[PDB]
């Protein structure tokens, strides 16, 4: 009986309910998606979601509040992606 609990899985827009999951390969939280594009959770959003950086909560529901398209310009980078990867950084808040 969860009429409202339906998540977006791609093409994320402000206001979408999303599942935020731990990605151990990139050592970061990401949006669950069917797309191959990566949507990393912005480090700013972790406190609002009761998540911690670096028991470790495997998923949380949130709402997208902002998205930014970015590119890795160093092979050593915060998201452990190959040089040149284009990806999104997403700020999300907790959901009711």
């Amino acid at each position: 009986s969860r009429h409202s609990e339906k998540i977006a899985i791609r093409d994320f827009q402000v206001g979408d309910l999303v599942l935020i999951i731990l990605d151990e390969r990139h050592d970061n939280y990401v949006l669950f998606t069917v797309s191959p594009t990566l949507y990393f959770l912005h480090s700013e959003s972790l406190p609002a979601l009761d998540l911690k950086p670096g028991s470790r909560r495997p998923w949380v529901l949130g709402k997208v509040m902002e998205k930014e398209y970015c590119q890795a310009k160093k092979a050593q980078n915060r998201f452990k992606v190959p040089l040149g990867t284009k990806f999104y950084r997403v700020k999300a808040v907790s959901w009711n």
Binding site: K67, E68, Y69, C70, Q71, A72, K73, K74, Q76, F79
Partner: peptide, 11 residues
């Protein structure tokens, strides 16, 4: 901070 660059800010 310069490991990544912004290509497109939030719309």
């Amino acid at each position: 901070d310069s490991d990544i660059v912004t290509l497109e800010p939030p719309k």
